């Protein structure tokens, strides 16, 4: 599990509503979050599987 799996969910400054997934270390689960559309971090996945296969 790469380092960025430990980074927090960054929606970003933009103000699109892209539902996405981030890995949650303290819960050891892939949870849903809104991505704003610009900037942010690698802890950002489009499927629940992509999060799990990468950071879980």
């Amino acid at each position: 599990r790469p380092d960025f799996c430990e980074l927090p969910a960054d929606t970003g400054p933009c103000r699109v509503r892209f539902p996405s997934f981030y890995y949650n270390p303290d819960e050891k689960k892939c949870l849903e979050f809104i991505y704003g559309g610009c900037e942010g971090n690698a802890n950002n996945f489009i499927t629940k599987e992509e999060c799990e296969s990468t950071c879980a």
């Binding site: 929606t11 933009c14 103000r15 699109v16 509503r17 539902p19 809104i34 559309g37 610009c38």
Partner: protein, 243 residues
Amino acid sequence: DCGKPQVEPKKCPVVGGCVAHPHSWPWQVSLRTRFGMHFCGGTLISPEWVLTAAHCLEKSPRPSSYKVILGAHQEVNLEPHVQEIEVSRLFLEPTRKDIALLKLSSPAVITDKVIPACLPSPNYVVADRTECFITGWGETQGTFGAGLLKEAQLPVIENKVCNRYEFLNGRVQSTELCAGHLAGGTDSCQGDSGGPLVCFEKDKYILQGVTSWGLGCARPNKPGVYVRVSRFVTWIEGVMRNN
């Protein structure tokens, strides 16, 4: 007549704000996936054209992957009288700003629930503290109106003040305008992107901004940043007439 709704809009003195009167913002568009989930706003500026933000079209350049919903009040339970039109063409603004044009696969029918908005003067600057309206089905953040068209009456904040360290600190460009209450609590949010920032000017509503970004939603001293439309009018005209 564009910019003139046949249902008189509420004035409300989207996080915070109020649920709008149905069809009082007839130019409001819900941009969607083929699945049909709302992820962005849009603005009917003419029967075949919708103005939005470029970040909404990030993933795919396929125009057929985009769907335009017109005359809605509910984000999910669409009214029976609603218009669902596919996008024919996308036009990203060349200097890579957060503004884009969607050409509709078929022109929208202008009714009393679907009316377009008016374009501002080229290089026009909305004066500081001008009260404009923000509409959209974005996040509400624990505030009422989730799933319904929400509106907010926000004052324009001039960029010299908006770029003060206390606020956005040099983040805001010439081709952007700031808007909102500095005390926070009322603002556009994720899901409102591409949405209209309209200003009542002559005797009708005029599109002056496009919901772009902000440092968080509805936070104190953190006004929303909007694409300054008046800077792209000339570009918009030439796209509509040549395409």
